[PDB]
Every structure is written in structure tokens, then in C-alpha cells.
Design an enzyme around this catalytic site. Structure first.
Site, PDB file in Angstrom:
ATOM      1  N   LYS A  68       0.820  -1.215   0.000  1.00  0.00           N
ATOM      2  CA  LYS A  68       0.000   0.000   0.000  1.00  0.00           C
ATOM      3  C   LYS A  68       0.861   1.277   0.000  1.00  0.00           C
ATOM      4  CE  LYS A  68      -3.988   2.004   2.494  1.00  0.00           C
ATOM      5  NZ  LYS A  68      -4.916   1.723   3.625  1.00  0.00           N
ATOM      6  N   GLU A 172     -11.052   6.248   3.668  1.00  0.00           N
ATOM      7  CA  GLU A 172     -11.119   5.593   4.979  1.00  0.00           C
ATOM      8  C   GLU A 172     -11.819   6.425   6.076  1.00  0.00           C
ATOM      9  OE1 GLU A 172      -7.027   4.351   5.473  1.00  0.00           O
ATOM     10  OE2 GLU A 172      -7.210   3.143   3.644  1.00  0.00           O
ATOM     11  N   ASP A 195      -7.082   8.042  13.572  1.00  0.00           N
ATOM     12  CA  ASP A 195      -6.892   6.686  13.076  1.00  0.00           C
ATOM     13  C   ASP A 195      -5.474   6.264  13.377  1.00  0.00           C
ATOM     14  OD1 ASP A 195      -6.458   4.352  11.572  1.00  0.00           O
ATOM     15  OD2 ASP A 195      -7.382   5.126   9.730  1.00  0.00           O
TER      16      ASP A 195
END
Ligand SMILES: NC(=O)c1cnccn1
Length: 378
Positions: A68, A172, A195
Site C-alpha cells: 500500500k 477511509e 486513526d
């Protein structure tokens, strides 16, 4: 249908289904509700997920994670060149694009990041098919709010190679706000998403009005997460082992890795208990390491790292041109937000404001992506 959401995460992924008006988060074949975004190549086979992460110490040069961090980027990009210095696997260039290079069945192979991510998504798809029966056709897949169009398209390409219809790529933080129904909860809402993952920290500020999401600011640290906390516990307990047994485990990479495994598990226990027990058999020269660690000791070893999470919060506010009192909703995402000291610092920073935290924070993103998939199908 089925209505499927996938959090394709840097080190762990999560899949949910929306059925009978509610999200079910899906455990994999080992019973884990999240799956390592790991792909390993051996002399005979390709392992994905738990099987890949479980042999990572044995096969580090041929076990891919963090694809990623490469997906949609050019090999020459500064982040790629910087990241490469910390990976045990080789990264090479093909037509200016990065590829991981591995040994597989006795030969050198190269894979684009979207090929590795497709293997991850295939595993997530099979996890959902084992849960539901039949085939999964479609999914919503999530990406970081800061992903550009090249990173978004390469993520979509991973879904295409897997044979999924990608209904939409959504951010997200947006998926987390959706999970809490914040678009349905008639006015604008400023939402802060905090997060904190295993190896990434993302703060996002969104506005939500009449179901429309806009990203106002993003901040954080792409190399800070739960693993940093574990490392603080490792150094502490390695010194303890040295003090009690006059044996330095530092030069021995198996002994450090086993201490690290114990510390990761102790840390999880410390988000719900005030003490955790370490029980390592034959850590070094046949000597056992049995000990205990308190939450207060864990918080002390991490004082800078926990307080330091407030600094991206202040930066995201400054960039959004918001006072902290103008945040209507705070959303916890990532396994590390379970740590009580992190929740307390954040809550005190926001003057006692309650946190949205009732959804398992490592599942909130897949949960919101599954709600979004239901809407799009429917
Ligand atoms: N944190 C560590 O990796 C570590 C600490 N002390 C000795 C050896 N390794």
C-alpha cells in the site's frame, strides 16, 4: 448482492457484509476478524494473510507487506526511496514503476504493488465467500483521504485483477463516519477521525452536510503506530532480562523477535487489564522469561509517543481553520485507539467530549464500506 466492504490496510485488512439491515464483520479461517495484508512466496507456493504473516521470520526476503506504501507511486518517488531502506524484501524498477522482487519456485519474480494487493483482495473475497456461500461480485474498497488519483486507480486495478466490480473507492475517514451514521445523525458537521494503526497515524477533518462529505484537512505520521509502542516495551523487558540473568539478548534476532511477540500480546491485554503476564520458555540459553508488566509502566515507557498524537490533531485544526470547540464528532479508528491513555489524552484535549468508540476501531472502516456497498447496490 452480497453488499461487501473491504478495508485494504497497510498491514491488516478487514471485510464486512451488510445483511438484514446490519453489518457483520467476517472472521477468516483462523477466526481472525482482520487479516494480514501479507503475501509470501516459498519454494512451492504463494501464502496470503495469516499463513504469510506466520512464516515472516523464517522467510523475510520473500514475504511482502506494505505494498500500500508503493501502490500508484513511481519508483523515483522520495517516499518509495526512503521506505525501501527499511524493508527486508527487494524493490526494483520496471518502466519507472516499483515492483517487489522475490524468489518463488526457485526463480526470480517481480510483482507490481496492485498485483500483491490483488492477492490480498482475493483472500478477503474468499473469506467473505466462505462466510456467505456462493460468489462475491462487488465491493466498496477504501483508501486514505490523501491518496491521489494514481493511487486510487491502482487500488481499483487490484480489485479488477481479483475479479471484483469496484462499486466505488471511498476515503477511509469517510467510511468510519458512515459506520457511525454521522451523515444521517439539518446542518453541517465537522468530524475528526483519529486513526492510529499498527504502523500509521492519520488525522482527518471532514465536513458532512446533507450526506455530502468534504475533506477539510489531513495530518499525521506515516511511520508511527502500535509497533512503536511494542518496541518501547521490548527495550524495557530486554533490560530487565539482562538485569535478572546477566544475558544480553540484543545481538540475538530470534530472542528479540520472541520478546516482541510477547510484548505485542501484553500490550493488547493492557487496553482492558491493568497488568499482563509474559511467559516465554527458553528465551536465551535455556533460561525462561516469566514476568509481568503494569499499564502504568507501559504508559510511562510511551509518554512522548502518546502525548505526541495530539500534535497532528492541532495541525489538522490549524489547516482546517477550526477551533477544537468546532468539532461535533470525534471517531476512533485503528487498533491502537483502544489504549485507555490515548483515549484520555484525546478526550481531555477536546474538553471532556465523548468519543465515538462503540465500533471495534480496527473494523470501523470495513463496517462503513459495507454500509456504502449496500447503498450503491440498493
Ligand atoms: N527494541 C529492540 O528491538 C531491542 C531492545 N533492546 C535490545 C534488543 N532489541
Amino acid at each position: 448482492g452480497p453488499a461487501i466492504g473491504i478495508d485494504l490496510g497497510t498491514t491488516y485488512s478487514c471485510v464486512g457484509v451488510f445483511q438484514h439491515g446490519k453489518v457483520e464483520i467476517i472472521a477468516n479461517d483462523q477466526g481472525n476478524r482482520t487479516t494480514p495484508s501479507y503475501v509470501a512466496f516459498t519454494d512451492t507456493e504463494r501464502l496470503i494473510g495469516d499463513a504469510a504473516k506466520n512464516q515472516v521470520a523464517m522467510n523475510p526476503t520473500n514475504t511482502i507487506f506494505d505494498a500500500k506504501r508503493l501502490i500508484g507511486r513511481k519508483f523515483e518517488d522520495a517516499t518509495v526511496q526512503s521506505d525501501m531502506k527499511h524493508w527486508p524484501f527487494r524493490v526494483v524498477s520496471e518502466g519507472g514503476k516499483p515492483k517487489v522482487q522475490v524468489e518463488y519456485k526457485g526463480e526470480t519474480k517481480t510483482f507490481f504493488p496492485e498485483e500483491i494487493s490483488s492477492m490480498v483482495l482475493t483472500k478477503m473475497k474468499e473469506i467473505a465467500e466462505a462466510y456467505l456461500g456462493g460468489k462475491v461480485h462487488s465491493a466498496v474498497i477504501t483508501v486514505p483521504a490523501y491518496f491521489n488519483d494514481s493511487q486510487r486507480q491502482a487500488t481499483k486495478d487490484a480489485g479488477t485483477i481479483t475479479g471484483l466490480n469496484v462499486l466505488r473507492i471511498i476515503n477511509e475517514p469517510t467510511a468510519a463516519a458512515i459506520a457511525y451514521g454521522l451523515d444521517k445523525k439539518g446542518g453541517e458537521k465537522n468530524v475528526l477521525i483519529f486513526d492510529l494503526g499498527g504502523g500509521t497515524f492519520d488525522v482527518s477533518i471532514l465536513t458532512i452536510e446533507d450526506g455530502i462529505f468534504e475533506v477539510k484537512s489531513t495530518a499525521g505520521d506515516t511511520h508511527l503506530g502500535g509497533e512503536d509502542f511494542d518496541n518501547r516495551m521490548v527495550s524495557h523487558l530486554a533490560e530487565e532480562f539482562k538485569r535478572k540473568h546477566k544475558k544480553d539478548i540484543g545481538p540475538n534476532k530470534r530472542a528479540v523477535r520472541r520478546l516482541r511477540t510477547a510484548c505485542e500480546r501484553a500490550k493488547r491485554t493492557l487496553s482492558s487489564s491493568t497488568q499482563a503476564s509474559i511467559e516465554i520458555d527458553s528465551l536465551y540459553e535455556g533460561v525462561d522469561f516469566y514476568t509481568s508488566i503494569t499499564r502504568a509502566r507501559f504508559e510511562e515507557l510511551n509518554a512522548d509517543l502518546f502525548r505526541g498524537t495530539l500534535e497532528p490533531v492541532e495541525k489538522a485544526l490549524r489547516d482546517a481553520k477550526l477551533d477544537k470547540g468546532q468539532i461535533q464528532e470525534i471517531v476512533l479508528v485503528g487498533g491502537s485507539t483502544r489504549i485507555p491513555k490515548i483515549q484520555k489524552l484525546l478526550q481531555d484535549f477536546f474538553n471532556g467530549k465523548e468519543l465515538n468508540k462503540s465500533i471495534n476501531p480496527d473494523e470501523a472502516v470495513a463496517y462503513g464500506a459495507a454500509v456504502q456497498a449496500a447503498i450503491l447496490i440498493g
